[PDB]
């Protein structure tokens, strides 16, 4: 599930503004569609007021390109370091950057490769 | 193949009921004969509208319910309000409700057979034509005259009104009891 | 009716076979589909009650136990003097419920 409609998103934002942040059970008792963990994940993913959902620049693209090679896995560790902190915009930006840019005898051999 | 509105109005004996949409029918003579009947009712005004006769009252806020005097004189509304205030029993009487339902029964204001429901039907509280010589109570109160209304003293000097020439008002050419001082 | 707007009645010629109602549809009217004021009994058609089609309910179509009757509101509105209201068609009802 978890379609995350706009009328549910406004109700979740009102519940986060009214009830609190560290009370996930109190916010899940006024929606009748998701659980407390799903509501907390939505509040930390899309309903967070500090999430930069737009303005993808070249400095952040160069920061993410110079970080995916140092750590290939663990995209959640590079979520708050890059500045996106959405845990899904980083993978989407990596997919966009990958799609747009696509469009003993062995040693003895190399030893004689330099001597020849 | 379709006659004009002037030709349909000149041929009809009662041309005060012809409309602009009646020329687009398949038989205007039968429609003009049926629309000029004695006890016929016209069609609703939602035939050309696009609001489906129920979307025009958007911002109009009205009262919840207007109860009659036969229900208000039983004390059930105050007991229901007290029960709603306590929740947010009475047992007043059993024969008084039967008396208010049978003996103290008020006949409501019905309507005529041709009195169809209009669109608004609340801002056009029209009533006959209270003319010259006949006025309502309260406006008597604002006027404050004890049992002529005093500007029919000046209907002496300046003359009978152009607007209602047939006029007679008391004491002048009309030789009056209660409210009505002219006919 | 109520339970089914796409259902069509038989409206055949009235015979001498008295109609019956099933145990699951007992007390329900045929035209008015009410539970109070029974005034006239239900009569079935001759082709609608023959062999295995006899003793079946008019509305429910199951095993009829008690005799069916028409509502008084349908009797005063002359809705009971029509043809035999046997349920012939069965659409959008008890079809997907058999799969579950």
């Amino acid at each position: 599930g978890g379609v995350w409609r706009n009328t549910e998103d406004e109700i979740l934002k009102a519940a986060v503004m009214k009830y609190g942040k560290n009370q996930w059970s109190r916010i899940a008792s006024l929606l009748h569609r998701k659980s407390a963990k799903q509501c907390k994940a939505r509040w930390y993913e899309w309903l967070d007021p500090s999430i930069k959902k737009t303005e993808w620049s070249r400095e952040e693209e160069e920061k993410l390109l110079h970080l995916a090679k140092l750590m290939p896995t663990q995209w959640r560790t590079i979520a708050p370091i890059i500045g996106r902190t959405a845990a899904q915009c980083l993978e989407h930006y990596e997919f966009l950057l990958d799609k747009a840019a696509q469009r003993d005898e062995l040693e003895m051999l190399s030893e004689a490769r330099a001597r020849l | 193949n379709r006659f004009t509105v002037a030709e349909l109005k000149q041929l009809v004996a009662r041309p005060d009921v012809v409309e602009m949409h009646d020329v687009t029918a398949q038989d205007p003579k039968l429609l003009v004969h049926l629309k000029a009947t004695r006890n016929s009712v016209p069609v609703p005004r939602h035939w050309c509208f696009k609001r489906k006769y129920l979307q025009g009252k958007r911002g109009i806020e009205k009262p919840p319910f207007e109860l009659p005097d036969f229900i208000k004189r039983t004390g059930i509304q105050e007991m229901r309000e007290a029960l709603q205030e306590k929740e947010e029993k009475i047992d007043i009487d059993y024969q008084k409700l039967h008396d208010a339902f049978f003996k103290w029964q008020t006949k409501p204001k019905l309507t005529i057979h041709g009195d169809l429901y209009y669109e608004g039907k609340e801002f056009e509280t029209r009533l006959k034509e209270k003319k010259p010589g006949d006025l309502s109570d309260e406006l008597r109160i604002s006027l404050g005259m004890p049992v002529p209304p005093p500007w029919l003293i000046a209907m002496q000097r300046y003359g009978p009104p152009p607007s209602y020439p047939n006029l007679k008002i008391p004491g002048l050419n009309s030789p009056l009891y209660g409210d009505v001082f002219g006919t | 009716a109520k339970h089914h707007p796409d259902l069509i009645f038989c409206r055949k010629q009235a015979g001498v076979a008295i109609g019956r109602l099933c145990e699951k549809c007992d007390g329900k009217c045929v035209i008015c589909d009410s539970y109070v004021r029974p005034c006239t009994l239900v009569r079935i058609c001759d082709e609608c009650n023959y062999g295995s089609y006899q003793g079946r309910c008019v509305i429910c179509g199951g095993p009829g136990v008690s005799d069916a009757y028409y509502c008084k509101e349908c009797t005063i509105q002359e809705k009971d003097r029509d043809g035999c209201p046997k349920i012939v068609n069965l659409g959008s009802s008890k079809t997907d419920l058999f799969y579950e």
């Binding site: 659980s35 963990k37 896995t73 995209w75 959640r76 560790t77 845990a87 899904q88 | - | -």
Partner: protein, 111 residues
């Protein structure tokens, strides 16, 4: 519990704050030792999910049986455990769709 989670918090912020890894040269030697050992034993690489496999449905039933036998035993619940049991039952009802879901997740969702 609160103390040891705080301890892991401090160590994780440390091991990312300093980048103090596992001595890159020794790391490279370890990776090379592993590559050489695996080649010497000549182990084949493990194939990714064979989509029409004879192995597939049988493996999925075995894993779901273990998951059911653990997560439900007898007459307890939650709401999270309820959704878990429900998805388990749906998998045991429409197995090929579940194998499709698993394959799509394992090849897609790297979060």
């Amino acid at each position: 519990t609160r103390l040891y989670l705080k301890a892991e918090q401090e160590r994780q912020h440390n091991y990312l704050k300093d980048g103090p890894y596992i001595t890159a040269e020794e790391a490279v030697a370890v990776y090379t030792t592993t590559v050489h050992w695996l080649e010497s034993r000549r182990f084949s690489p493990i194939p990714f999910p064979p989509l029409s496999y004879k192995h597939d449905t049988k493996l999925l039933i075995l894993a779901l049986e273990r998951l059911k036998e653990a997560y439900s035993v007898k007459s307890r619940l939650n709401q999270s455990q309820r959704e878990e049991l429900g998805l388990i039952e749906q998998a045991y009802d429409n197995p090929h769709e579940a194998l499709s879901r698993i394959k799509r997740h394992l090849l897609t969702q790297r979060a």
